[PDB]
Design a binder for this molecule. Structure first.
Ligand SMILES: [Mg+2]
Lengths: 23, 101, 10, 1328, 16, 550
């Protein structure tokens, strides 16, 4: 789907997503 | 298409309807240069040029509705447009637009 | 016994 | 010695005399096409066979029928060169004579009522060029022979890898040339089953019931009978001595052991044995028994006899009981058990079963079942076991008769079944499927015949359909045949088949190897994914037939092979190899060709076997091979010998010097890469060779060979004219042989094809002498590369891995400079808006780019053109285009607007620089010719007129010379004749009848000469001036030929003949290169580390031998330079040619002074030496040659560093190596793309250098990026570089604006996938 | 017999 | 449904499938309007079902429909599934812009972070950046002016290109990419030519050798990608193998040979027994031809030890060594013992040196040390003059006698077999055993002959010294070659196998120096073809296994 992989440099980015979905 | 069956004709067909990126960049640069050239012109006069040629608007207008703005007479609209072009072919303010031809 | 519609038709 | 050989004699280091010279290399193609195309009275091969197999055909009702009389081939419309120029297939018309014969309905059938003779056109048959190639659509193509399985019956097994236990299942398989396949297998329950074209198994008995076999007949066929009787109220058994060899034995005189040898007591011989009743209880019946009173069947065949059955047959009165034989080792109950498991009880119940398994889910009827089984195997139309197949079947089943038959019968099936049961029992063995006696060679002629038969059948269906209508009074045979299906079949085979391959034309060796190649793939062959280890392997029967070295390295390993040097095909398509007969202990020169089957029984010696003066073997025990195993055998037991040492290897492997010192892995690479060599400007002989180059050069056809002997009348770089000798003249012939040479013609791989004269005017030539040298040929010898000075040492890491360091001198003298000819086409078509025009009026282009263009818009000949230059100017009509408002204002300010047409013109490709050497214009009939077209038209007429006049002048000169000789047989004075003017000879008046008659004859001959010359000129003019048949919608085509001189540079791939390849890393200056004590620098520095690990030691020996040969060359160079006496030149040459105990006896004393001087002049640049494969030069000979040339015996010199002047610490191996420039050039392998074209559907960059595409970031690259953790780089590659259209446009804009940021979006491929999944009725969606 | 063995081990193939 | 050249049209099979479905549907409606027998309606419904299933999945329900080319039509399921499907050909793998490809040569002057890039290739790849800089610095008024300026190849265009790639990393890849080291980031250096120049020390990471190999190049665009290339993908960062942790940039071939030759020891060399102040004086003596590279001398060495706790202790002392060992110590970074260099240096010794430098000094020191090591190895391999020749393949005189003994006792055991003492299988087994023993003994004799020589020392006594044979040096240094290769070059090829697995009774008794006759070469090919085919199939098997594991 062209998004960043949840590993390495993009990992933190994906973390923020589950910081938003939890709230 | 080929000894190895993996290749096919379909993957050697171009898309002729696409716009080259250099052409799009040229269009953007032309818009910017036209805006810069017209910004050095009087409000009424630049408006006459803009809304005669349809720049930054949805449609184009002929001389009649451009006249119907303030001065309904058509000949003044023609003369002011001629003055627009006459000042727009001055070497002091026409070098940038020359490179786009 | 068969899957071809032609044979069933005949 | 021939004159061409006498000019430069190669020294032979071989020791074994050659009895059989290597045959013509391209026989496998020419012989096959001659079989296909020539008329054979026996009608077993080619077009006659197809016509007789197809004709005569009969109408279903029977009113009339069509008969075949004869066939012929017409005259070709164009020649080979013309066909290549225009782009048409070189072919001949097929004209077949047929009789439409109409019978009489009222009269008895067979009465001839009317006949109609007529010739019918059956299509164009492509022709084979004298060199074994075809010209299809103007392209040279080669049809590769196929290795398939011969038709017949093969017996095989699963090797115990199918059932849970071992239980090796056995199967038999019959395959015809055309028809259905029949399989008889065994199950784990030991019952034989049947398959018909690989479907569900059925019991075997059906296949015999259908043949009309009752059960008792079946047990009679498949079993042996043992008889019992009631003699004197006792059980009596028919004793057979062999059977007996657990009960009490009768014949009290010679009682054997009782319930506890046989031969001793069976010596006397008796016939009466008594057996207990139990001996019958466990044994099965054999004959159906009926009682007259009861009228019922007491016991059936294949039923186990019981005690109650004994009682019934006792009361019934039957005394004799014949029963079957069943063992556990020699005989088996397989047939009886199969009959037990059978469900069919009669013939009809059998055909219904065959019909159900044939056509499942169909109502079975008797007539349809009978027709189906008749057509399956017993019908000639649908089943044809060919002559080869019939021979194989007869040999397999041991049948002697029915050689002409091609359809199966009862005896055939019962014999196949018998052999299968025998092989189970233990007598007999399965067949080796990879054995070369079980594999057949199918060449171009056979395949063309098959396709022509297919076309004949497709026409024939329609012909039979029409003949049944009945209204036939006004019809003709030519109104019944449509040639289009047959033409479609033949062009299908010759243009779209896998085995009709694009020609390999890098060098003569590539062409020869391509023509001598056998493929197991193609129609009726293998598949790469379905090929296993066994088929790819080297079989023991490949000896002398298939080369074990030459095969592609890759997925096609072992599936494509090369013919051996002496290999041949027999009349049945099986490869055979020659051998020398050994009679009475002597090794004779008589040669017998043996196949794989015949080779097994005999034991065959080797060419390496030592021989005595009397012609017999020297060693008492010689090394030989028998039945495929090598060993040591006595001298008197030896039957055959090998004819040559190069018999097992192909031509390419035969061209590798010192092959015996190279590992087979590297020999494979060397053989493969000798075919990728590119011809250079100047062809140089290999100093170290094998003696085969002359054969390849002559048989390739690239050279000009003398058809007849004589003296060279005229030489020019484009024409050789030979005055034929008096002894070799056809009566009434001109006496002139004219050879027109090909000059700078593009090859299939964009390489120059050029012929250079090697003769001088006035020198004598003979038959077979080389007059001109083609590409990669030097004085009749194959010249694939150049002789390079080689030093084996590391040099500052520039020869790391396989890298090559080359001196600049090699670049300066253009030793590896190649000419590449490239074709560029501009097609002016017809469009909806209008017709495209070829004019010089190109919008928005100044006169700077129009300088090289003429008035018609076509570039001149001889123009130096670089990348982007216009070659042909073409303008295409364009429709109205919307202009953006900013563009409208821009046009308002400056009024320039000229956009009626758009510039679509042919331009030189980027990074390509060359000269225009030829321009050809093709114009449709009905389109006006532009000025350039008429310029070329008139130039062609001028050239044709001049050349026709030249041939006329030379032929008339020769003919008048012969006439002058005839007159000089009497003798007169020609000054008086020359006093009268030549034309005025026709104005003489003669009154005597004798002179007047001669005058009239001369006038008539002059008129005939004028008429024939006129007809030739008219034919050529009509051919030149006629229009071209172009593709529909095409108006004009312009073709431009560009010649590019490509020079050596880093990135180019250079290799030798021993599998040592490399890429040039640096072009070193001459001063930096290592040099010897005499100041001579090396040319190429090679890494020694490559040699020990790859076991290619032949290259070191080649280096040493090249050093010695070049040293002898410098000795001859000096001895000529000091103008030394000819006697010492002769002495030195004789000493050189007498070195070693070789088979070559060259006498310099019998050579003339001019011949000796010419030989010395050809030997200045080095002495060519021949080292035959497996008969090469020993180390002692190399050391002796080095000693003669005043060089170190070790082959190592003291080298000094050019940079520092210091001597290297250890001696370095310096010599000469034959190096090749492979067709893997960095010019054709660079590619770079920033932004270009995109795919229509996926919206992704295209693929390939031709499309200016982008490299593929595959799955493993994504895996590597994920492993690194570079998420943003991966997102860049996925979205903004491949298929995010808006993202990539904004990314380009941002880079132009110097921002270097991306706004990724959704890849288009994902949206396409979503649309596809939606189209499958599946709802796939995205949520927020 | 080295790479087939690894593939069989990672596929958890049942022995014969 | 798009046009091609000459008026021809190209279409997709979905058009044919949809047309069939529509035609059969319309015929069904027509048959339901014009009242027809139930048999015809049933047949039409069967055809409609078959057409719809063929459109959705051709070949699943029965016989697959074929087009005018007599090949099966490929449906939506075929267009979404398979190796050539959308998932694997267009989604997990794509063709990308800003990419190039070229043949690779060797750059021995490069550093570990540098790669040689052609000027034309970089001009094509970095075209938008050149346009942007020409616009920024004012050499071009518009973008078309920049386009023509780049196309005409002016000099200031080359200066702009130089300043663009000044610190722009570029990604080099070689197929197949078995591990993540198959793609690495390098700093480009423009070279006049057409081939990419690759640092030798990374070749082992790429499995790349210069016989015609080609490499692809990719240009990261955004700042995040550039920093990922500089931090994670840079070749200096990835010098350890992720599979085991061992270094991957270890030297090989000519570097190992040069370091081995420079560190060897010779008896009675020029300048033996001399006293040297340090490595500088050793180099001075070597350059002045006073002492050889292999002269045994005494050198004053200052040596610094960095302990585990970080203590730095320096000791100067007199060490018995060679000239070459001191000249090699000249480049060893501070913090390592001299014992790592005071020995002959094969591949294992250099690997140990690099491992110790990494473990006790870090990454930058390791990179500098590796670069200096490979420079010195190349230089002194060039200076050595090591060459392979036909006289270096010495064949022991014991081979002929041993072959004669084996043949004679083969005759004896065959005669014994004719007497019936033992069976055929036993005879086969013991003949194989004797031939294996003979091969082993011949190899041992050849190794003993090749591995040593006799020299004269300063006292005049004959002494036993390690051989300076070229092939022996190549095998012992570990640069290339092993004992088996030397055995086939100078001893006995040995026993080869019939291609079903069985071993032929008679072995090959000739090495490659003397040459083989027809049958020996035929038996060799029997195994050569099997080896090639086994490699070809095993590559695909390993690829499928690694796909499953990933
Ligand atoms: Mg390679």
């Amino acid at each position: 789907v062209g998004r960043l992989i949840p590993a390495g440099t993009g990992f933190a980015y994906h973390q923020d997503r589950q910081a938003k979905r939890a709230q | 298409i080929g000894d190895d069956e993996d290749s096919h004709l379909g993957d050697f067909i171009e898309d002729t309807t696409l716009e080259l990126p250099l052409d799009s960049a040229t269009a953007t640069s032309l818009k910017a240069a036209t805006r810069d050239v017209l910004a050095g012109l009087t409000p009424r006069e630049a408006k006459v040029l803009r809304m005669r040629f349809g720049i930054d608007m949805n449609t184009d207008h002929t001389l009649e509705e451009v006249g119907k703005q303030f001065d309904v007479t058509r000949e003044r609209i023609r003369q002011i447009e001629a003055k627009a072009l006459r000042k727009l072919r001055h070497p002091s303010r026409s070098e940038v637009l020359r490179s786009f031809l | 016994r068969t899957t071809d519609p032609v044979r069933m038709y005949m | 010695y021939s004159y061409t050989e006498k000019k430069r004699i190669r020294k032979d280091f071989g020791t074994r005399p050659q009895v059989l010279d290597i045959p013509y290399l391209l026989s496998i193609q020419l012989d096959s096409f001659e079989k296909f195309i020539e008329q054979d009275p026996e009608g077993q091969y080619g077009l006659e066979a197809a016509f007789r197999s197809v004709f005569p055909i009969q109408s279903y009702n029977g009113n009339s029928e069509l008969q075949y009389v004869s066939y012929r081939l017409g005259e070709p419309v164009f020649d080979v060169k013309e066909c290549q120029i225009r782009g048409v297939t070189y072919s001949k018309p097929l004209r077949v004579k047929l009789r439409l014969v109409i019978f009489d309905k009222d009269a008895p059938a067979g009465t001839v009522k009317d006949i109609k003779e007529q010739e019918v056109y059956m299509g164009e048959i492509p022709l084979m060029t004298e060199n074994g190639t075809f010209v299809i659509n103007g392209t040279e193509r080669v049809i590769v022979s196929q290795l398939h399985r011969s038709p017949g019956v093969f017996f095989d097994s699963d090797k115990g890898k199918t059932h849970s236990s071992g239980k090796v299942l056995y199967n038999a398989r019959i395959i015809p040339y055309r028809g259905s396949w029949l399989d008889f297998e065994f199950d784990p329950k030991d019952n034989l089953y049947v398959r018909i074209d690989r479907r569900r198994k059925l019991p075997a008995s059906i296949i015999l019931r259908v043949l009309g076999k009752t059960s008792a007949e079946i047990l009679d066929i498949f079993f042996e009978k043992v008889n019992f009787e009631v003699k004197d109220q006792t059980l009596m058994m028919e004793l057979v001595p062999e059977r007996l060899r657990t009960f009490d034995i009768e014949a009290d005189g010679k009682v054997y052991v009782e319930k506890g040898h046989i031969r001793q007591l069976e010596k006397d011989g008796v016939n009466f044995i008594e057996v207990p009743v139990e001996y019958i209880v466990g044994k099965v019946s054999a004959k159906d028994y009926v009682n007259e009173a009861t009228g019922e069947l007491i016991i059936t065949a294949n039923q186990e006899i019981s005690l109650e059955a004994l009682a019934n047959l006792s009361q019934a009165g039957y005394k004799k009981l014949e029963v079957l034989f069943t063992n556990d080792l020699d005989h088996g109950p397989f047939m009886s058990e199969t009959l037990r498991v059978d469900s069919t009880t009669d013939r009809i119940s059998a055909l219904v079963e065959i019909y159900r398994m044939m056509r499942p889910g169909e109502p079975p009827t008797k007539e349809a079942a009978e027709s189906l089984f008749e057509s399956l195997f017993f019908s000639a139309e649908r089943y044809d076991l060919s002559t080869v197949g019939r021979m194989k079947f007869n040999s397999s089943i041991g049948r002697e008769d029915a050689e002409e038959q091609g359809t199966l019968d009862e005896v055939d099936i019962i014999e196949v079944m018998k052999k299968l049961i025998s092989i189970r029992n233990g007598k007999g063995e399965v067949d080796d499927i990879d054995h070369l006696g079980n594999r057949r060679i199918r060449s171009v002629g056979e395949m063309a015949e098959n396709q022509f038969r297919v076309g004949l059948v497709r026409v024939e269906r329609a012909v039979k359909e029409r003949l049944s209508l009945g209204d036939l009074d006004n019809v003709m045979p030519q109104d019944l045949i449509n040639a289009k299906p047959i033409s479609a079949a033949v062009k299908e085979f010759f243009g779209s088949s896998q085995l009709s391959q694009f020609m390999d034309q890098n060098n003569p060796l590539s062409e020869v190897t391509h023509k001598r190649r056998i493929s197991a793939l193609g129609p009726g062959g293998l598949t790469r994914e379905r090929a296993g280890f066994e088929v790819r392997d080297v079989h023991v029967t490949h000896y002398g037939r298939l080369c074990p070295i030459e095969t592609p390295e890759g997925p096609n390993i072992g599936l494509i092979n090369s013919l051996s040097a002496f290999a041949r095909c027999n009349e049945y398509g099986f490869l055979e190899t020659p051998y020398r007969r050994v009679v009475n202990g002597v090794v004779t020169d008589e040669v017998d060709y043996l196949s794989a089957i015949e080779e097994g029984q005999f034991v065959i010696a080797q060419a390496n076997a030592k021989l005595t003066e009397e012609g017999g073997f020297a060693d008492e025990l010689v090394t030989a091979r028998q039945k495929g195993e090598s060993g040591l055998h006595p001298r008197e037991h030896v039957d055959y010998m090998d004819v040559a040492t190069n018999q097992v290897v192909s031509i390419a492997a035969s061209l590798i010097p010192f092959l015996e010192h190279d590992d087979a892995n590297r020999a494979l690479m060397g053989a493969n890469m000798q075919r990728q060599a590119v011809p250079t400007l100047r062809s140089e002989k290999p100093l170290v060779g094998t003696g085969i180059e002359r054969n390849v050069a002559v048989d390739s056809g690239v050279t000009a060979v003398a058809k007849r002997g004589g003296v060279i009348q005229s030489v020019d770089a484009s024409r050789i004219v030979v005055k034929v000798n008096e002894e070799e003249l056809i009566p009434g012939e001109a006496g002139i042989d004219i050879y027109n040479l090909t000059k700078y013609t593009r090859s299939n791989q964009n390489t120059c094809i050029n012929q250079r004269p090697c003769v001088m005017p006035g020198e004598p030539v003979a038959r077979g002498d080389v007059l001109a040298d083609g590409p990669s040929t030097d004085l009749g010898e194959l010249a694939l590369g150049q002789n390079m000075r080689i030093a084996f040492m590391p040099w500052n890491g520039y020869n790391f891995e396989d890298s090559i360091l080359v001196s600049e001198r090699v670049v300066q003298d253009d030793r590896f400079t190649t000419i590449h000819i490239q074709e560029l086409s501009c097609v002016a078509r017809d469009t909806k808006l209008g017709a495209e025009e070829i004019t010089a009026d190109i919008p928005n282009v100044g006169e700077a780019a129009l300088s090289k263009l003429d008035e018609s818009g076509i570039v001149y000949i001889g123009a130096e053109v670089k990348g982007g230059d216009i070659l042909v100017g073409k303008v295409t009509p364009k429709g109205e285009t919307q202009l953006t408002p900013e563009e409208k204002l821009l046009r308002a300010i400056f009024g320039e607007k000229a956009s009626d047409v758009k510039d679509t013109s042919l331009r030189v490709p980027n990074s390509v620089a060359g000269t225009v050497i030829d321009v050809q214009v093709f114009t449709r009939d009905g389109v006006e010719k532009d000025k350039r077209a008429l310029e070329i038209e008139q130039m062609q007429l001028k050239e044709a007129k001049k050349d026709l006049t030249e041939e006329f002048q030379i032929l008339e000169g020769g003919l008048l010379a012969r006439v002058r000789s005839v007159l000089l047989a009497g003798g007169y004075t020609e000054a008086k004749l020359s006093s009268i003017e030549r034309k005025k000879w026709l104005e003489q008046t003669l009154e005597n009848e004798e002179l007047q008659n001669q005058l009239e004859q001369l006038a008539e001959q002059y008129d005939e000469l004028k008429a024939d010359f006129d007809k030739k000129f008219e034919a050529k003019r009509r051919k030149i001036t006629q229009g071209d048949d172009l593709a529909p919608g095409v108006l004009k085509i312009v073709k431009v030929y560009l010649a590019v001189k490509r020079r050596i540079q880093p990135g180019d791939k250079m290799a030798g003949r021993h599998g040592n390849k490399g890429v040039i890393s640096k072009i070193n200056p001459v001063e930096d290169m290592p040099y010897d004590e005499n100041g001579q620098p090396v040319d190429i520095v090679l890494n020694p580390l490559g040699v020990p690990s790859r076991m290619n030691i032949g290259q070191i020996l080649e280096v040493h031998l090249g050093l010695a040969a070049k040293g002898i060359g410098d000795k001859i160079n000096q001895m000529i330079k000091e103008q030394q006496e000819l006697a010492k030149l002769r002495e030195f040459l004789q000493k050189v040619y007498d070195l070693g105990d070789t088979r070559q006896r060259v006498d310099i004393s019998e050579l003339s002074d001019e011949d000796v001087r010419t030989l010395a002049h050809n030997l200045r640049a080095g002495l060519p030496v021949a080292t035959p494969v497996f008969d090469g030069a020993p180390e002692s000979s190399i050391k002796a040659m080095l000693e003669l040339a005043d060089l170190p015996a070790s082959g190592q010199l003291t080298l000094f560093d050019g940079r520092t002047g210091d001597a290297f610490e250890r001696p370095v191996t310096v010599g000469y190596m034959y190096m090749l420039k492979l067709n893997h050039l960095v010019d054709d392998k660079m590619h770079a793309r920033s932004t270009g074209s995109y795919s229509l559907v996926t919206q992704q960059p295209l693929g390939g250098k031709a499309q200016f595409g982008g490299q593929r970031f595959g799955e493993m690259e994504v895996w590597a990026l994920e492993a690194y953790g570079a998420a943003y780089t991966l997102q860049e590659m996925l979205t903004v570089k491949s298929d995010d259209v808006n993202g990539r446009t904004k990314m380009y804009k941002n880079i132009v604006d110097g921002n270097h940021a991306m706004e990724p979006g959704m890849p288009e491929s994902f949206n396409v996938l979503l649309k596809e999944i939606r189209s499958l009725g599946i709802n796939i969606e995205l949520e927020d | 017999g080295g790479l087939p063995r690894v593939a069989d081990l990672f596929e958890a193939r049942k022995p014969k | 449904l798009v046009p091609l050249d000459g008026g021809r049209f190209a279409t997709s099979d979905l058009n044919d499938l949809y047309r069939r479905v529509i035609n059969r549907n319309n015929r069904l409606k027509r048959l339901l309007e014009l009242a027809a027998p139930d048999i015809i309606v049933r047949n039409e419904k069967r055809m409609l079902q078959e057409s719809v299933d063929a459109l959705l999945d051709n070949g699943r329900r029965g016989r697959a429909i074929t087009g005018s080319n007599k090949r099966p039509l490929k449906s939506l399921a075929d267009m979404i599934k398979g190796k050539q499907g959308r998932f694997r050909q267009n989604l997990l793998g794509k063709r990308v812009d800003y990419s190039g490809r070229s043949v690779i040569t060797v750059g021995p002057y490069l550093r570990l972070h540098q790669c040689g890039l052609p000027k034309k290739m970089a001009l094509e790849l970095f075209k938008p950046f050149i346009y942007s800089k020409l616009e920024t610095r004012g050499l071009a008024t518009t973008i078309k002016a920049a386009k023509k300026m780049v196309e005409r190849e002016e000099a200031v265009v080359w200066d702009i290109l130089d300043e663009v790639i000044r610190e722009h990393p570029v990604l080099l890849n070689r197929a197949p990419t078995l591990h993540r080291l198959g793609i690495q980031a390098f700093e480009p250096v423009l070279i006049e030519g057409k081939a990419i120049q690759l640092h030798p020390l990374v070749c082992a990471a790429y499995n790349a050798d210069f016989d015609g190999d080609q490499m692809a190049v990719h240009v990261p665009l955004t700042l995040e990608a550039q920093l990922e290339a500089r931090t994670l993908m840079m070749s200096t960062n990835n010098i350890l193998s992720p599979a085991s942790g061992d270094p991957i940039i270890v030297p090989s071939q000519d570097v190992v040979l040069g370091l081995y030759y420079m560190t060897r020891e010779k008896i009675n060399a020029k300048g033996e027994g001399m006293y040297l102040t340090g490595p500088a004086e050793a180099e001075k003596a070597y350059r002045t031809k006073t002492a050889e590279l292999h002269a045994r001398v005494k050198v004053r060495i200052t040596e610094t030890i960095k302990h585990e706790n970080g203590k730095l202790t320096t000791e100067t002392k007199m060490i018995d060594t060679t000239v070459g060992r001191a000249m090699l110590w000249q480049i060893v970074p501070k913090g390592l013992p001299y014992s790592l260099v005071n020995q002959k240096l094969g591949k294992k010794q250099i690997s140990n040196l690099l491992n110790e430098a990494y473990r006790k000094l870090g990454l930058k020191d390791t990179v500098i040390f590796a670069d200096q090591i490979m420079y010195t190895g190349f230089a002194y391999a060039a200076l050595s003059g090591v060459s392979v020749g036909i006289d270096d393949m010495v064949v022991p005189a014991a081979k002929y006698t041993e072959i004669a003994e084996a043949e004679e006792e083969v005759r004896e055991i065959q005669e014994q077999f004719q007497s019936g003492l033992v069976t055929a299988g036993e005879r086969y087994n013991k003949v194989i055993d004797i031939w294996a023993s003979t091969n082993d003994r011949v190899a041992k004799a050849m190794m003993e002959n090749l591995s040593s020589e006799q020299v004269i020392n300063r006292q005049g006594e004959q002494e036993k010294q390690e051989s300076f044979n070229s092939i022996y040096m190549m095998a012992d240094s570990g640069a290339r070659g092993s004992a088996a290769q030397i055995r086939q070059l100078a001893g006995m090829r040995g026993l080869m196998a019939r291609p079903d697995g069985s071993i032929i009774e008679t072995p090959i008794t000739a090495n490659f120096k003397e040459g083989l006759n027809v049958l020996q070469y035929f038996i060799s090919t029997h195994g050569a073809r099997k080896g090639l085919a086994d490699t070809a199939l095993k590559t695909a098997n390993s690829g499928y296994l690694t796909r499953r594991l990933v």
